[PDB]
Design an enzyme around this catalytic site. Structure first.
Site, PDB file in Angstrom:
ATOM      1  CG  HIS A  62      -0.155  -0.049   2.523  1.00 30.97           C
ATOM      2  ND1 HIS A  62       0.334   1.081   3.141  1.00 30.97           N
ATOM      3  CD2 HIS A  62       0.224  -1.094   3.295  1.00 30.97           C
ATOM      4  CE1 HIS A  62       0.982   0.735   4.237  1.00 30.97           C
ATOM      5  NE2 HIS A  62       0.931  -0.580   4.355  1.00 30.97           N
ATOM      6  CG  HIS A  92       5.674   6.209   5.583  1.00 31.41           C
ATOM      7  ND1 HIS A  92       5.807   5.647   6.836  1.00 31.41           N
ATOM      8  CD2 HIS A  92       4.533   6.933   5.615  1.00 31.41           C
ATOM      9  CE1 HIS A  92       4.788   6.014   7.590  1.00 31.41           C
ATOM     10  NE2 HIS A  92       3.999   6.795   6.873  1.00 31.41           N
ATOM     11  CG  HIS A  94       0.468   8.789   3.827  1.00 30.27           C
ATOM     12  ND1 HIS A  94      -0.353   7.698   4.017  1.00 30.27           N
ATOM     13  CD2 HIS A  94       1.318   8.809   4.878  1.00 30.27           C
ATOM     14  CE1 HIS A  94      -0.019   7.089   5.140  1.00 30.27           C
ATOM     15  NE2 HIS A  94       0.992   7.743   5.682  1.00 30.27           N
ATOM     16  CD  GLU A 104      -2.186   9.645   5.967  1.00 29.65           C
ATOM     17  OE1 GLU A 104      -1.364   9.489   6.893  1.00 29.65           O
ATOM     18  OE2 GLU A 104      -2.996   8.759   5.618  1.00 29.65           O
ATOM     19  CG  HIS A 117       3.627  10.633   7.843  1.00 28.88           C
ATOM     20  ND1 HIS A 117       2.512   9.831   7.761  1.00 28.88           N
ATOM     21  CD2 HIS A 117       3.170  11.907   7.882  1.00 28.88           C
ATOM     22  CE1 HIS A 117       1.427  10.582   7.750  1.00 28.88           C
ATOM     23  NE2 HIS A 117       1.799  11.847   7.825  1.00 28.88           N
ATOM     24  CB  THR A 197      -2.538   7.824   9.220  1.00 32.48           C
ATOM     25  OG1 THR A 197      -1.425   7.346   8.458  1.00 32.48           O
ATOM     26  CG2 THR A 197      -2.133   9.086   9.989  1.00 32.48           C
TER      27      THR A 197
HETATM   28  C1  LIG Z   1       6.605  -2.442  10.647  1.00 35.47           C
HETATM   29  C2  LIG Z   1       6.335  -0.965  10.431  1.00 35.47           C
HETATM   30  O1  LIG Z   1       7.233  -0.117  10.511  1.00 35.47           O
HETATM   31  N1  LIG Z   1       5.028  -0.687  10.140  1.00 35.47           N
HETATM   32  C3  LIG Z   1       4.554   0.675   9.898  1.00 35.47           C
HETATM   33  C4  LIG Z   1       4.065   1.278  11.207  1.00 35.47           C
HETATM   34  C5  LIG Z   1       3.554   2.680  11.008  1.00 35.47           C
HETATM   35  C6  LIG Z   1       4.389   3.808  11.176  1.00 35.47           C
HETATM   36  C7  LIG Z   1       3.898   5.112  10.980  1.00 35.47           C
HETATM   37  C8  LIG Z   1       2.532   5.263  10.607  1.00 35.47           C
HETATM   38  S1  LIG Z   1       1.899   6.891  10.356  1.00 35.47           S
HETATM   39  N2  LIG Z   1       1.083   6.917   8.936  1.00 35.47           N
HETATM   40  O2  LIG Z   1       0.962   7.099  11.452  1.00 35.47           O
HETATM   41  O3  LIG Z   1       2.999   7.822  10.265  1.00 35.47           O
HETATM   42  C9  LIG Z   1       1.688   4.163  10.431  1.00 35.47           C
HETATM   43  C10 LIG Z   1       2.212   2.896  10.637  1.00 35.47           C
HETATM   44 ZN   LIG Z   2       2.305   7.807   7.345  1.00 34.85          ZN
END
Ligand SMILES: CC(=O)NCCc1ccc(S(N)(=O)=O)cc1
Ligand SMILES: [Zn+2]
Length: 258
Positions: A62, A92, A94, A104, A117, A197
């Site tokens: 995803h 990462h 989005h 987001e 993020h 998220t």
């Molecule tokens: C194993 C691993 O690292 N999974 C991802 C965990 C995860 C990290 C950050 C976010 S967010 N979108 O809230 O910044 C969601 C999931």
């Molecule tokens: Zn994220």
């Protein structure tokens, strides 16, 4: 997986498998500047990342994640609303199906093209990401809104790596990279208690949303969307989008450092 961003397994239906989706500390949210509360006890954000901690880039179906070695405090986040030191472990993005949406978090109702993020976990209180992930004060994520416009040269190494992890499950070495180079010049921010998220959606995240946006071109966003969610050999299925709609503040207060 039992969840995704499609009609049947998307954000609107996550509550079926993950009841917390309707919780009181869900993210992302719409930041209304007229309701933010300026806190003078908020210290400046301080990031110190060691490029040697960059480890690997992975296509997780995803989205795609860039992970870092988190065995020590070579790369940490401090200051802001924190008293403890948070250890960097991943960053990462989005994005949306088109440039008009993708981020987001939103500010005063305005939606941006994508969002960066940078995640960290509380190594002062906990011993691992797995342990910290479910703790109210376990994670800290810096969110940076990405506004479509001029191409962002500092995204180059990341974009050039995507060709090696085109399909679900593929992973490759991603080394010698300091993600602080992706943050905006100004670190003024907004902060509020939230959650991951997407599933598992743990309400364990202290969010740090930057006031200043960074750029990204239409073509660079196209590269994100060219990643495939299917496994090698199967019919190609582009990663069109992966941003969750904003959720109810439920009484929470968004604090401003400025
Ligand atoms: C194993 C691993 O690292 N999974 C991802 C965990 C995860 C990290 C950050 C976010 S967010 N979108 O809230 O910044 C969601 C999931
Ligand atoms: Zn994220």
């Amino acid at each position: 997986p039992d969840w995704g961003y499609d009609d049947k397994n998307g954000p609107e239906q996550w509550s079926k498998l993950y009841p917390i989706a309707n919780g009181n500390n869900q993210s992302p949210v719409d930041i209304k500047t007229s309701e933010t509360k300026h806190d003078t006890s908020l210290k400046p954000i301080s990031v110190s990342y060691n490029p040697a901690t960059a480890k690997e880039i992975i296509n997780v179906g995803h989205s795609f994640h860039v992970n870092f070695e988190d065995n020590d405090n070579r790369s940490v986040l401090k200051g802001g609303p924190f008293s403890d030191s948070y250890r960097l472990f991943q960053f990462h993005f989005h994005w949306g199906s088109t440039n008009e949406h993708g981020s987001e978090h939103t500010v005063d109702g305005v939606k941006y093209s994508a969002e960066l993020h940078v995640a960290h976990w509380n190594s002062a209180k906990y011993s691992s990401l797995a342990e910290a992930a479910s703790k109210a004060d376990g994670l800290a994520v810096i969110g940076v809104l990405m506004k479509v416009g001029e191409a962002n040269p500092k995204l180059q190494k990341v974009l050039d790596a995507l060709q090696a992890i085109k399909t679900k499950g593929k992973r490759a070495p991603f080394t010698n990279f300091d993600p602080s180079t992706l943050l905006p010049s100004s670190l003024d921010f907004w902060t509020y208690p939230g959650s991951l998220t997407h599933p598992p959606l743990y309400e364990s995240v202290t969010w740090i949303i930057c006031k200043e946006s960074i750029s990204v071109s239409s073509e660079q966003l196209a590269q994100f969307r060219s990643l495939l969610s299917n496994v090698e050999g199967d019919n190609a299925v582009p990663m069109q989008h992966n941003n969750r709609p904003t959720q109810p503040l439920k009484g929470r207060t968004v604090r401003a450092s400025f």
